[PDB]
Design a protein around this ligand. Sequence first.
Ligand SMILES: O=C1CCCC(=O)C1=C(O)c1ccc(C(F)(F)F)cc1[N+](=O)[O-]
Ligand SMILES: O=C1CCCC(=O)C1=C(O)c1ccc(C(F)(F)F)cc1[N+](=O)[O-]
Ligand SMILES: [Fe+3]
Ligand SMILES: [Fe+3]
Lengths: 367, 370
Amino acid sequence: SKFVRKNPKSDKFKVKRFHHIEFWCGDATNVARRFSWGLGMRFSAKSDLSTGNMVHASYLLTSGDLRFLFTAPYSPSLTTTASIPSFDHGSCRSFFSSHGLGVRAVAIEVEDAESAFSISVANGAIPSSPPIVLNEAVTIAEVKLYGDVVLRYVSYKEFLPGFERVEDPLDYGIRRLDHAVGNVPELGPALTYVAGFTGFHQFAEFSGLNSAVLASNDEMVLLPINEPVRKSQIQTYLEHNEGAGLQHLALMSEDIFRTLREMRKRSSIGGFDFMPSPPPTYYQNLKKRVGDVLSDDQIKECEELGILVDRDDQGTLLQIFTKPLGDRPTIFIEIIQRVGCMMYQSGGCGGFGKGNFSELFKSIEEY
Amino acid sequence: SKFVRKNPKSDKFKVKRFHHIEFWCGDATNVARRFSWGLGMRFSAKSDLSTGNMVHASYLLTSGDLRFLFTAPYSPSLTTTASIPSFDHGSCRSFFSSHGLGVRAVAIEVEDAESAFSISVANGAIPSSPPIVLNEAVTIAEVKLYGDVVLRYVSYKEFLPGFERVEDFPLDYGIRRLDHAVGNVPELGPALTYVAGFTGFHQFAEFSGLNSAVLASNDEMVLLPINEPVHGRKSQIQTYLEHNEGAGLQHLALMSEDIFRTLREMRKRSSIGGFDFMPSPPPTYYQNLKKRVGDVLSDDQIKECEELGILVDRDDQGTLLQIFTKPLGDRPTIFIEIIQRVGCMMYQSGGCGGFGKGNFSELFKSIEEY
Ligand SMILES: O=C1CCCC(=O)C1=C(O)c1ccc(C(F)(F)F)cc1[N+](=O)[O-]
Ligand SMILES: O=C1CCCC(=O)C1=C(O)c1ccc(C(F)(F)F)cc1[N+](=O)[O-]
Ligand SMILES: [Fe+3]
Ligand SMILES: [Fe+3]
């Protein structure tokens, strides 16, 4: 009848929001051009040859507050010209040879990046890049998160110094990043490592995996982690990804129907593909499950677009998943819309979809 | 008053057509998805994990007879499961680390691929992959062309054994075939005598920052131009050799059956995934058009070129429409030429109208005016 969560607010430094995500590429132009058309993200800021960067090409896509950065290295024959100081040509080709197209950096806005970096290392974090102050404007620092992903700290005194603003329409309703999930071999150690240096508390849950969720004090920076337990997808991931790494990004949309009707039109002409849709029983069982949250027309709309729906104690959740973004069966995208919990709306409203494993199964047991 | 052309038909083996072009990628899925939407090429055949290939992912785009192959390597921890036998994981990462996104293979249909390979090596060609017979169906062989590009020989007894046909309503911007494939090289003389030395390709005569000869097969339908940098405004070909870390393919020219359609489609998509184009010639250029190709293009077709930014050139045999994209990837190296040829219809003879060498001048004296 009642579910109660706790929140010690045990953050070891002041954390604000997700700042951006840095993909590492072989050729960043094509990847950014496809992501832009397939997700509806505007070309916003560049740091390439045309801006004078002879170390790496970096292209930034935005939609709402969501910031996808796409970095690919230039030839070593053409350091000081790189806008992102923590970039190394060799670490980049190693990452792409080993893991392929994937997320390098999970970056978050924090009060002071040297403050965050100092405590993190002192509380166990493995350092990657120390605090570099860019033009006395932004501070940047990187610690190891899981595998070859880095948690990157960004703090302030069009995106970073050295980037040039790209002026211009494209917009499918995606407004912000919601959570970023990492697949690791052993949950226990990875969980005690990350929470050990961030002070992130565990967000409670209302298969082939085990999943805990680490969260900041206001529960707006959400970092779930999966463990491998039909062969487990997480295990397949660890093989094709040659280790631990970010599994999926969840992108909050202000209207999942719009974003899906846009993203679905473009699946065959450049965009992104989606998982095969649940059996029609699933949406018939919707009417007596979230019928007091979604109208019947909104339920018909989910069946047309293949959207999963889940509920927990505080709210209701709409969500759908793409197919792997690149060549390897590794990283994919989650589109979500959260309903309820509007105090502002509290993050994690509706959970993460853990219930859909069952409900989707017993949809297939029927039918 | 008169330009006369010769043709010794000195081919050392039987050569038919351009078969396909193999790009080497870091991630072939995104590159092929972008090229498909930005050029209007249909997803036709795959050889990835979903077909059982654990060495490399290969995705084929088509439009008319044009075949763009996009290959990217999988992890070595998962040779026998690879559909393309000449693929090596290390040669691929070396290529992409060194040159970035570029063309690996220029492949052409020939009568017998072991026949072509044997003579080529015997006439100087540097071998890369010997003749491998796939499922007693198609033969494949590769010799070095320029730098790390390979001339690949393909002969027959959806695309290769091991590939699975992709059913698609379908995208199509009017591109129908590949016209020519150009390589930038440090020294023209040696590269020219090397390639023609083992193919027997004759020189196609020409009616800047570069020196350009054109090597051609007997029917002048497989066209392989080569550029050289002229030193001492800095030569683009020289900049290419720096960013490309050596010689390599510079541009592919894609014949369209209607360059206006193909560009009104391709320009719509420049800002939403597709390809961008060079800044348009000054309006004087298109004014001088009316008394230059006015007996070939109507006034409406001339206004249409000004709207789409198309260059026009003429030679002894015919007239040429052409326009160039910006570099396809991160590096200022490889780009695309869209072309439509007019005249010379005996069938239409390749090289009709030349290649645009006159436009350097016409473009300039347009800017000297205005
Ligand atoms: O948000 C999360 C984090 C923990 C792992 C997880 O299961 C979550 C999902 O994004 C999610 C939700 C539902 C489904 C299902 F079962 F409907 F397919 C799948 C996922 N998932 O793993 O991407
Ligand atoms: O087709 C060729 C091969 C030889 C070299 C060459 O210049 C050709 C062109 O594709 C061409 C023609 C005209 C222009 C101009 F005038 F616009 F600059 C440029 C090129 N080009 O991109 O090489
Ligand atoms: Fe999720
Ligand atoms: Fe050309």
